[PDB]
Design a protein around this ligand. Structure first.
Ligand SMILES: N[C@@H](CCC(=O)O)C(=O)O
Length: 248
């Protein structure tokens, strides 16, 4: 029944690996898929998982137009957006979000053993390239930040745009591995990476504080119900278990 838009991002949404042929929703696994299964049991609904066609989370272009999963919800092309989608002020003007099912903050993914300790250290220099995922909430944060240092940084990554910004997190992580590059990535995603490559580390603390929520078109009856469901899973300690299962 319900159409759920999502995006491939480890360990939230991934293609399940099997020796036998997988069809439909079975092709996907991960934190967000366990959550979606839970939500459909609690609210009792069927669903079809579809990746967002342009592979973007969603940003508003210079002419006011949106893309990514946000656009899909806006154009009623999807009922739910269940993915590590950041709840932001700008997005709340065009779609509704459930209450957060996970919290995080923008931080820095970089290698270990350098004198770089914060965004400032990155900002006041130029040898180390740094950037974020194109059309994601992190890129938008820097693009709209009125704080000098972040404003300085947006200037840097937007000039070297075609280069500083990456298509997705996997490409950004690979850029951190094979280049002198620091990735502006969200904290729980960084936790997952550094947890698997002891050469990588989080630089500084969180630049901001926020959360991930299930997106729905504006005025959807499902939003409050999903919030109630998230609150239940939280209450019975399943959100913790799910986090531990995937981040291990
Ligand atoms: N979670 C972000 C994407 C990743 C990022 O921009 O750091 C979003 O909802 O757009």
């Amino acid at each position: 029944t319900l159409i759920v838009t999502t995006i491939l991002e480890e360990p939230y949404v991934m293609y399940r690996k099997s020796d036998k042929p997988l069809y439909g929703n079975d092709r996907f696994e991960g934190y967000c898929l366990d959550l979606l299964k839970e939500l459909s049991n609690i609210l009792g609904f069927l669903y079809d998982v579809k990746l967002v066609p342009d592979g973007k989370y969603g940003a508003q272009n210079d002419k006011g137009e949106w893309n990514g999963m946000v656009k899909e919800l806006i154009d009623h092309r999807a009922d739910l957006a269940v993915a590590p989608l950041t709840i932001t002020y700008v997005r709340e003007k065009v779609i509704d979000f459930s209450k957060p099912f996970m919290t995080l903050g923008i931080s820095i993914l970089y290698r270990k053993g350098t004198p770089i300790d914060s965004a400032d250290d990155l900002a006041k220099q130029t040898k180390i390239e740094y950037g974020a995922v194109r059309d994601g909430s992190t890129m938008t944060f820097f693009k709209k930040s009125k704080i000098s240092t972040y404003e300085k940084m947006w200037a840097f990554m937007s000039s070297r745009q075609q280069s500083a910004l990456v298509k997705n997190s996997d490409e950004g992580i690979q850029r951190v591995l094979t280049t002198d590059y620091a990735l502006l990535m969200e904290s729980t995603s960084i936790e997952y990476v550094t947890q698997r490559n002891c050469n990588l580390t989080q630089i500084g603390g969180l630049i901001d504080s926020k959360g991930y929520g299930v997106g729905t078109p504006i005025g959807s009856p499902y939003r409050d119900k999903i919030t109630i469901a998230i609150l239940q899973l939280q209450e019975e300690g399943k959100l913790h278990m799910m986090k531990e299962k995937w981040w291990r």
